[PDB]
Enzyme design. Structure first.
Site, PDB file in Angstrom:
ATOM      1  N   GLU A 127       0.778  -1.241   0.000  1.00 57.17           N
ATOM      2  CA  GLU A 127       0.000   0.000   0.000  1.00 57.17           C
ATOM      3  C   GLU A 127       0.813   1.296   0.000  1.00 57.17           C
ATOM      4  OE1 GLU A 127      -2.853  -0.313   3.205  1.00 57.17           O
ATOM      5  OE2 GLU A 127      -3.620  -2.213   2.411  1.00 57.17           O
ATOM      6  N   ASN A 169       2.688  -4.774  -3.150  1.00 62.75           N
ATOM      7  CA  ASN A 169       1.247  -5.015  -3.057  1.00 62.75           C
ATOM      8  C   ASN A 169       0.480  -3.715  -2.798  1.00 62.75           C
ATOM      9  OD1 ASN A 169      -0.696  -7.162  -2.831  1.00 62.75           O
ATOM     10  ND2 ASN A 169      -0.889  -6.728  -0.634  1.00 62.75           N
ATOM     11  N   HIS A 205      -9.665  -6.301  -2.701  1.00 62.99           N
ATOM     12  CA  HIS A 205     -10.694  -6.183  -1.677  1.00 62.99           C
ATOM     13  C   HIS A 205     -11.763  -5.411  -2.433  1.00 62.99           C
ATOM     14  CE1 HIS A 205      -8.716  -7.749   1.825  1.00 62.99           C
ATOM     15  NE2 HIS A 205      -7.689  -6.927   1.708  1.00 62.99           N
ATOM     16  N   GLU A 233      -5.476 -10.780  -1.742  1.00 61.93           N
ATOM     17  CA  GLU A 233      -6.346 -10.657  -0.572  1.00 61.93           C
ATOM     18  C   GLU A 233      -7.806 -10.545  -0.981  1.00 61.93           C
ATOM     19  OE1 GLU A 233      -5.011  -7.673   2.118  1.00 61.93           O
ATOM     20  OE2 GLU A 233      -2.882  -7.895   1.566  1.00 61.93           O
ATOM     21  N   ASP A 235     -11.661 -10.749  -1.467  1.00 62.15           N
ATOM     22  CA  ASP A 235     -12.891 -10.842  -0.692  1.00 62.15           C
ATOM     23  C   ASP A 235     -13.811  -9.793  -1.304  1.00 62.15           C
ATOM     24  OD1 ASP A 235     -11.601  -9.239   2.381  1.00 62.15           O
ATOM     25  OD2 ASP A 235     -12.058  -8.396   0.410  1.00 62.15           O
TER      26      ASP A 235
HETATM   27  O1  LIG Z   1      -2.805  -5.934   3.264  1.00 63.70           O
HETATM   28  C1  LIG Z   1      -3.763  -5.778   4.010  1.00 63.70           C
HETATM   29  N1  LIG Z   1      -4.893  -5.057   3.544  1.00 63.70           N
HETATM   30  C2  LIG Z   1      -6.017  -4.790   4.412  1.00 63.70           C
HETATM   31  C3  LIG Z   1      -6.349  -6.003   5.233  1.00 63.70           C
HETATM   32  C4  LIG Z   1      -5.117  -6.311   6.092  1.00 63.70           C
HETATM   33  O2  LIG Z   1      -5.314  -7.447   6.927  1.00 63.70           O
HETATM   34  C5  LIG Z   1      -5.989  -7.073   8.152  1.00 63.70           C
HETATM   35  O3  LIG Z   1      -5.120  -6.219   8.913  1.00 63.70           O
HETATM   36  C6  LIG Z   1      -5.729  -5.772  10.146  1.00 63.70           C
HETATM   37  C7  LIG Z   1      -6.036  -6.972  11.049  1.00 63.70           C
HETATM   38  O4  LIG Z   1      -6.698  -6.529  12.223  1.00 63.70           O
HETATM   39  C8  LIG Z   1      -6.925  -7.974  10.318  1.00 63.70           C
HETATM   40  O5  LIG Z   1      -7.065  -9.147  11.110  1.00 63.70           O
HETATM   41  C9  LIG Z   1      -6.329  -8.338   8.952  1.00 63.70           C
HETATM   42  O6  LIG Z   1      -7.266  -9.115   8.220  1.00 63.70           O
HETATM   43  C10 LIG Z   1      -3.886  -6.586   5.166  1.00 63.70           C
HETATM   44  O7  LIG Z   1      -2.730  -6.858   5.933  1.00 63.70           O
END
Ligand SMILES: O=C1NCC[C@@H](O[C@@H]2OC[C@@H](O)[C@H](O)[C@H]2O)[C@@H]1O
Length: 312
Positions: A127, A169, A205, A233, A235
């Site tokens: 990020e 990422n 996401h 990641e 979802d």
């Molecule tokens: O790359 C990322 N993008 C956002 C979600 C994050 O994961 C999130 O981090 C915060 C934690 O509290 C949570 O359990 C986890 O899922 C991740 O590391």
């Protein structure tokens, strides 16, 4: 194909999940983790706050458990994440200039070295950009070190781990936009100057009924720069509670994502950020949103399951 694992296996790709080591003691959780995926990433165990709680004091217990789970079940291991503005201890946020730089390089080196030979790929930097273009506006690294911290992290990672696939990422970069464009320029630059960089991770996401129509195209232009690409990641967030209609749309969405990856020869695969909605990170972060994973709170396959199986 009876599992998403062999489906992904047959497509010569990876299908992973974000693991919370503590949940392995939960039978149903382990059964799904064991049988439905061929890759695993630490949802939290390998982040800065979890690996270096105090300066120069490392805690690899949680991370080692995740690594052991991968080796024990024969799954590929993905590392997340070396340099990230979030979940960064205060002791680090209190350092500046030389001190900070030194701590960043040290963190990268120690964590990379510790998992060397086990972690196959690393989200070295996570990020770094901002929605709308340019660099992230609330990052300790960007504020204290400027534009050069990214290259420094990658060089330091490559120095500690000669063969690991080093990735950068981000999120909201799945389609072509100002954010992905800035990321694109960085990647093109790095490959041009020979800066260690082998892959780009698209967090993915997403929100239901909002999968970018140019996902494939965007994945392809990055791959054409000479680097692998991966959905890291995945979802798909929806307004809760869930209903048949939203679950169906979500299923169609998951299909789109996996298909985009399937249509790009360099797309290593897809990793979903968790297994069940029971533990998904969404609800606590996005009020009124959730039900974003392939399995629901009762560990029942949602429509998304069959969609992924089909896409692969
Ligand atoms: O790359 C990322 N993008 C956002 C979600 C994050 O994961 C999130 O981090 C915060 C934690 O509290 C949570 O359990 C986890 O899922 C991740 O590391």
């Amino acid at each position: 194909a009876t599992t998403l694992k062999e489906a992904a296996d047959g497509a010569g790709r990876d299908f992973g999940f974000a693991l919370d080591p503590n949940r392995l003691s939960e039978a149903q959780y382990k059964a799904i983790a064991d049988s439905e995926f061929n890759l695993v990433v630490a949802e939290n165990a390998m982040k800065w706050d979890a690996t270096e709680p105090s300066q120069n004091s490392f805690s690899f217990g949680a991370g080692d458990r995740v690594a052991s789970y991968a080796a024990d079940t024969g799954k590929e291991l993905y590392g997340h994440t070396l340099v990230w503005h979030s979940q960064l201890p205060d002791w680090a946020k209190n350092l500046n200039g030389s001190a900070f730089e030194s701590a960043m390089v040290n963190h990268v080196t120690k964590v990379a070295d510790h998992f060397e030979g086990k972690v196959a790929s690393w989200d070295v930097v996570n990020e770094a950009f901002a929605d709308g273009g340019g660099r992230r506006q609330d990052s300790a690294f960007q504020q204290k070190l400027g534009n050069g911290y990214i290259e420094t992290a990658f060089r330091a990672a490559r120095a500690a781990d000669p063969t690991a696939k080093l990735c950068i990422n981000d999120y909201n970069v799945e389609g072509i936009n100002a954010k992905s464009n800035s990321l694109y320029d960085l990647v093109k630059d790095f490959k041009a100057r020979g800066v260690p960089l082998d892959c780009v991770g698209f967090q993915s996401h997403l929100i239901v009924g909002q999968v970018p129509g140019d996902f494939r195209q965007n994945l392809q232009r990055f791959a054409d720069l000479g680097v692998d690409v991966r959905i890291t990641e995945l979802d798909i967030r929806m307004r809760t509670p869930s209903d048949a209609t939203k679950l169906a749309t979500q299923a169609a969405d998951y299909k789109k994502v996996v298909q985009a990856c399937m249509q790009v020869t360099r797309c290593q695969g897809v990793t979903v950020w968790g297994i069940t909605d029971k533990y998904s990170w969404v609800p606590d972060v996005f009020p009124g949103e959730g039900a974003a994973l392939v399995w629901d709170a009762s560990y029942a396959k949602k429509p998304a399951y069959a969609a992924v199986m089909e896409a692969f």
